[model samples]
Target: ARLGRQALLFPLCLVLYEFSTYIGNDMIQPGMLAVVEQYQAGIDWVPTSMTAYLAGGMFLQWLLGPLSDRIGRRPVMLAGVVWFIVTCLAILLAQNIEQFTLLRFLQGISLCFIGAVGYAAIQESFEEAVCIKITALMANVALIAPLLGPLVGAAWIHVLPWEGMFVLFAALAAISFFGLQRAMPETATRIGEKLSLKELGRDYKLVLKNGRFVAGALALGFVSLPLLAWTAQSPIIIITGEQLSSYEYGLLQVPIFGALIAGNLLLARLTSRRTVRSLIIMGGWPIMIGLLVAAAATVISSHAYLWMTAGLSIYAFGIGLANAGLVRLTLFASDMSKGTVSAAMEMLQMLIFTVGIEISKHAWLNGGNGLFNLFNLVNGILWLSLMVIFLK
Candidate 1:
């Protein structure tokens, strides 16, 4: 009983840290218009800040992951939580959108510790099935941020300054920091590994050289690209394009991420009964179908928003169905240490996310729904093809 409690508590703490980082961005999104208006910045700065945050995830993994291998996961995680705390608080002080974007980028570095150090530790500490279940649960709970953030932020900004959102985030992060201080254990077995440039380069080279690892990582990225693109584009689409209220914008997120949670619950239920490949194959159908529906709706349907929502919700379900298994497979694909492998996975995935966002933004700018749907259609097909080639 005691052991089980500890197991639950540890992952719960990690999940809290993950939640804080995600909510910091999601909750503030509703208030981004306020930021733009106050600074007289272009609307483009909104998504630019989002991209900068993701870019930050790619910034530090090469060093932090190997450092965790050398020293310990505990210290690295603690440091990241501290950095998140600092950055969240710093955002409140930004005089302009550029400064805010830079700080958002810094805040994104917090995800690296969660992926490289915290997730690597979880993967190391738990059995494969247990790790996947915990990860699914984590994703389910953490998703509450995106699912509800805009709603909460819409209501929140009406009452308080947007900067107060950061204050609340900092407090939550501090709580998570202390919880981690108590619950986060050292899972790195390679405590004495050298953290040198040559060793780091070689380790990353080895991870990149593995075909399965690279493919699985890319598969993870492409699988998530649609959702990530929506995250960056939604405010512009719903609020700017459709002229919808921010509250309605929040409501739209419900089906997308809600479907994702339902799929995660189903994935958790099926983990013991199904093979990873089978689960991944099961996920592919909805992904392809939903994107096709969404693409076609753009051109053919008068009720485009409703159809787009239904299709993307279905796509999100497929993601939840397949994501945990893919993460587990990719993390273990290489013989390299979990830290380096996890970091590499995050770095590659974030790069894909950044590029996908750029593509969607360009598509949105060039031809509105038609061009954007083309990107969606092409992305979905590519993702499905990769899953077939690689999961086999």
Candidate 2:
């Protein structure tokens, strides 16, 4: 009974973290340039908030993962939850772009701890079979955020200020913190030496140098980059280019998210009997095909939004199939510190995604038509080429 209760801790934490983080993080990006315009901030400066948040969160995971390994998961997670609450409060009170950017960086740092600790705790608490089950379940449940975030944000912004979104996130964080304190247990048993900067650098180099690791990480990045780029650019495309309202854009995400959920369910069923490697290859093929179709449709038709969304939905489904399996494969292959290995994978993936979004946004700002379509094409090709080399 106690173990069952303890197992629920990590998964529950993931759901709460996803809910709050998705609301707070995703709310700012889709219309961030507009927000900058409204507030009289320079157009060039707006995208930095997103980049800074991604960099802060991605880089800090290295420190937090090993730190948890040395100390314990429970205390680190509690600290992270508290930090998230404080930063959400900061966002609610932010008055300028600089303040918002700083708060977002802090929010990102907080998220790393929540994510690393939750995954580490689950890895320690459960056997392989159980872990896969729990992970699959969490993936399915957490899909709610991506589906609901835009909808909720669109409606909330209609009546309330954008800052109210963060205020609500702060309340959610508080509840999560207290709930974790009451339920979570200390799962770290392998007390390693404290992670040092030198060790971290060396470990990062090792992971990056491994061809298989790099390919896998890059594949994961390509899968996510198109989605992130879409999030950053699609609102502008739909609202200005296609003449859709915020509510309409939000409603359009339903089909995209439905595809993601369906893909996860399919992968969950397959992973019950298949290897992670097989899953990765299986998932990659559909995404590659989807992107090609999207690119061709954009060239052939004026109704790009319909084709683009359908293509992205298919791509997201492929991502759902591959994501957990890739994580499992990485974890299984690491010979050194598992925490360090996990952190490196996550950090590289985020950095790649950050670059993808930056490049895509830059193109859009320069008045490039179908910038996201271009992104998907490039990303899909890269993933397909790498899968051929690495999965062979």
Candidate 3:
């Protein structure tokens, strides 16, 4: 189905589903403190819930991707939204930290569908340039949850119970459900094929054997490490390390996120005019330079927030420019199954970023600094690896 005026609904449905699922995690975060307090549970469950949520994203991709290829994207996408809706509603019934973690993980599985089904459908349905632009736009929209979720959640829980947030998530999911029922296209060609562990394993092995695909997938994750590190470490660095106020900490995030938005806008504009390879190369320069400057700034330690903000903005902008193009190229790397390939790519990238965060956490604590030094070292290795993969 060509996306005529009515077809515009497809991306809107996508935006809705993505926003609801991600916001399920983000908006509930501020409320988690209250949740633990109400249940008489330890605060340690807070980070455990976050870990469970992320781990859930990684859990089902290997299976969901091939399942979509077998059953069809429309059904899988619709089912995922239903799953998210149920999980969000179930959170209202959670009475303990254990119960909430289980529901949270299930809710996070909503992310797997976006990678394995929703995004795969987009890549297959649209031409390369259009898909890149769509992905870029969608990426920017996804940031809305992270950018505004905590602030909204704080205000929301002030007046309402934590369970009220899930009601809102359910409401959002219901909108996506109806919208996607109308607009979501069936894109899979292997609809009649049966799903099997043997077949799934073979398909995954084939994707892994593709050098170009593997490189691009890994690069996708590594490029995101610096940004992810900043997001995780910023509060600790700004509040505890620098002794800054919470409002000031929040303000410092503006340049970084704003640059990323600017970069995505630029990428969307240039999609029709430039090669994906050219955009990635163009984007890499700023990433490397920004990381270098930020690493150097740590040595002075006088105006850490200001300098780090400037450096990170440049770095995030480069990510905005290159990330969608990289996704386009990586997803196209294998001919086996777009859904399967995408699942692998998403897993690899998420794993890289997760592992990078863990490593950077230790490095920052041991070294007594912000994450700039570790980010610089890791990103340099990753950027060089990416260039070698792309150039050769």
Q: TM-score, each model?
A: 0.90, 0.89, 0.82
Number of colliding residue pairs in model 2: 0
lDDT score for candidate 1 against the true structure: 0.82
lDDT of 2: 0.74
Query: Who wins the lDDT comparison?
Result: 1
Q: CA lDDT of each candidate? A: 0.82, 0.74, 0.76
The ten-residue window of minimal lDDT in model 1 covers: 1-10
Q: Model 1, 1-392: lDDT tens per residue? A: 35556777788878888887887778776788778888899777767767888999799988876688789989888999899989988888889888989999998888777777788788879899999798767767676888777778778877898888888888888888877777777887779966579867888898889998898899888888888888777877788877788767888898999898888889979999999889988988888888888888887853377788888999999988988888888888898876678778989988988888887888887777656666887887877777777876
Q: What is the lDDT of residue 35 in candidate 1?
A: 82
Worst lDDT 10-window in candidate 3: 43-52
Residue 47 lDDT in candidate 2: 55
**After aligning candidate 1 to the native by TM-score, how far in Å is the CA of 334 from where it should be?**
2.7
| Residues 113-135 of candidate 2: C-alpha lDDT, one tens digit per residue | 75578777878777999887877
> lDDT, candidate 1, residue 324?
85
Model 3's TM-score against the true structure:
0.82
